[PDB]
Amino acid sequence: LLRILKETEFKKIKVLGSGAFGTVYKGLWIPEGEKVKIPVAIKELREATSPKANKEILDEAYVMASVDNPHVCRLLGICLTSTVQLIMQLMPFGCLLDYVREHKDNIGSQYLLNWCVQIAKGMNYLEDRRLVHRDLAARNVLVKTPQHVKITDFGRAKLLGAEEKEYHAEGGKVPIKWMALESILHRIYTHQSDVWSYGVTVWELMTFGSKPYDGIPASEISSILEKGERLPQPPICTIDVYMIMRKCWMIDADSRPKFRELIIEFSKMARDPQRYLVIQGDERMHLPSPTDSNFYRALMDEEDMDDVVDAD
Ligand SMILES: CC(C)c1cnc(N2CC(CS(C)(=O)=O)C2)c2cnc(Nc3ccnc(N4CC[C@@H](O)[C@@](C)(F)C4)n3)cc12
């Protein structure tokens, strides 16, 4: 399932991102001289020689290769040299968090609630595969087209044994502001801690990209959760939507909704989106259609491919 490829059959055209994760490139698969040039995303390990960093990207690659679903990102391939490179699908509109921030004045209720369904469907798929993501957040949801998003970033994902309910984590830097209380306090992750993370993710979307608990330092979060403080109701949210969010943040993990329930409830809501999200000018808001998206690709591909001509 892990397809080990030759690095030399890949051309890096653009740096799409660089950070803790390393570097992500827009790249071309060119296996036969000039005949086929297929766009991929390439994530490259920076700390080539780090035993820990090598463990993290090889665990990521292992989990990401095991997943076949329309709302999750699969690993196409891996290159092993002095470093590791994950070959992944190019997602032309990048991550959903940057997207909702950049396109807020054109995002309608129908797109917001569809994303909620799509992320729940994907999380439900991962649950059925016995995967606890442990890092669900709007930054870890990528946009193939405005109408089609996929969960990614399996760097923290853990595969549970059959009928095993929880994963007990060691020490490490953890995304406190997206974690269930039991995860913060006791390092316990389940499908239900993923449901807490999903609640924060919906909250990120409904606020067009607000940072959770803005200003409050991570160290104060377990304390505010214990006092019953949760993320505020986003202005566009009717109480029915904010109630699903609040249910995802109940102290008792088993009282939190199930991804399969969240699919049924967000789906219901997406059939009458303007009843459940109140957005000004919702009726006259437009985003690139799937065909307009294929165009945008072709436009950007053209200018990128022209920059490879006035270079190399
Ligand atoms: C930084 C990542 C999330 C990223 C950013 N921007 C992209 N763009 C494509 C567009 C320019 S274009 C194509 O129109 O010329 C801006 C990204 C495109 N595709 C991806 N692909 C994937 C596919 C699957 N998984 C990941 N990951 C998961 C692991 C993380 O560490 C990650 C940062 F590598 C993203 N990335 C990412 C784009």
SS3 string, the chain, reads: CCCEECHHHEEEEEEEEEECCEEEEEEEECCCCCCCCEEEEEEECCCCCCHHHHHHHHHHHHHHHCCCCCCECCEEEEEECCCEEEEECCCCCCEHHHHHHHCHHHCCHHHHHHHHHHHHHHHHHHHHCCEECCCCCHHHEEEEECCEEEECCCCCCEECCCCCCCEECCCCCCCHHHCCHHHHHHCEECHHHHHHHHHHHHHHHHCCCCCCCCCCCHHHHHHHHHCCCCCCCCCCECHHHHHHHHHHCCCCHHHCCCHHHHHHHHHHHHCCHHHHECCCCHHHCCCCCHHHHHHHHHHHHHHHHHHCCCCC
Residues in Cβ contact with 23 at an 8 Å cutoff, skipping those fewer than 6 apart: 15, 17, 43, 44, 46
Is 88 a pocket residue for ligand 1 (Cβ < 6 Å)?
Answer: yes
**How far apart, in whole angstroms, are the C-alpha atoms of residue 150 and residue 92?**
12
**Ligand 1 atom 16: the closest Cα is on which residue?**
94
Q: Determine, yes or no, domain membership for 310.
A: no
- Ligand 1 pocket test: which of 142, 153, 294 has the largest number of ligand atoms within 8 Å of its C-beta? 142
CA of 24 to the centre of ligand 1 (A): 6
Q: Are 128 and 159 spatial neighbours (Cβ–Cβ below 8 Å)? A: no
The answer to whether 128 is a known catalytic residue is: no
Judgement on whether residues 81 and 99 belong to the same structural domain of the protein: no
Catalytic pick among 59, 128, 135, 310: 135
How remote is the C-alpha of 100 from its chain's centroid? 13
Residue of 63, 64, 24 whose CA lies nearest to 44: 24
**Ligand 1 lined by 75 (C-beta under 6 Å):** no
**Are 59 and 151 in the same domain?**
no
CB 198 within 8 A of CB 262: yes
Q: How far is Cα 67 from Cα 133, in angstroms, rounded to an integer?
A: 12
**Are 103 and 220 in a shared domain?**
yes
CA-angle at 32, arms to 28 and 37, nearest 5°: 25
8 A C-beta contact, residue 126 and residue 71: no
- Documented resolution in Å: 2.4
281 in the same domain as 137: yes
Q: Does ligand 1 come within 6 angstroms of the Cβ of 62? A: no
Pocket test for ligand 1, best of 90, 98, 154, 303 (most atoms within 8 A of CB): 90
**Closest to 212 in 3D by CA, of 236, 229, 193:** 229
**How many separate domains does the chain show?**
2
Please indicate, yes or no, whether residues 70 and 114 belong to a single structural domain of this protein: no
Closest residue (by CA) to atom 34 of ligand 1? Answer: 43
Cβ 300 under 6 angstroms from ligand 1: yes
For residue 73, give the ligand 1 atom closest to its CA: 24
User: What is the span of the domain harbouring residue 263?
Assistant: 91-289
Whether 14 and 148 share a structural domain: no
In a domain, 2, yes or no: yes
Task: Please answer whether residues 158 and 167 qualify as being in contact, where contact means their C-beta atoms are separated by less than 8 angstroms.
Answer: yes
Distance CA 217, CA 235 (A): 24
State if residue 92 touches ligand 1 by the CB under 6 angstroms criterion: yes
Same domain, yes or no: 68 and 118: no
Rounded distance between C-alpha atoms, residue 61 and residue 74, angstroms: 9
**CB contact at 8 A, 77 and 65:** no
Q: Is the CB of 22 under 6 A from ligand 1?
A: no
Specify the residue with its C-alpha closest to ligand 1, atom 31.
21
Residue 100, exposed/middle/buried by CB under 10 A (0-12, 13-18, 19+)? Answer: buried
User: From CA 303, how far away is CA 98, in angstroms rounded?
Assistant: 22
16 and 142 housed in the same domain = no
Cβ(72)–Cβ(65) below 8 Å: no
Give the number of C-alpha atoms closer than 13 A to the C-alpha of residue 57, restricted to the C-beta side: 27
Contact (Cβ atoms closer than 8 angstroms) between residue 202 and residue 116 = yes
Give the Å distances, CA to CA, from 145 to 17, 93, 279. 19, 7, 22
**Structure-derived torsion over alpha carbons of residues 288, 294, 295, 299, reported in degrees to the nearest 10:** 120
User: Per the domain annotation, does 6 fall within a domain?
Assistant: yes
The answer to whether 119 and 268 have CB atoms below 8 angstroms apart is no
According to the entry, how was the structure determined?
A: X-ray
Domain shared by 59 and 177, yes or no: no
Angle in degrees, CA 69, 74, 68, rounded to 5: 30
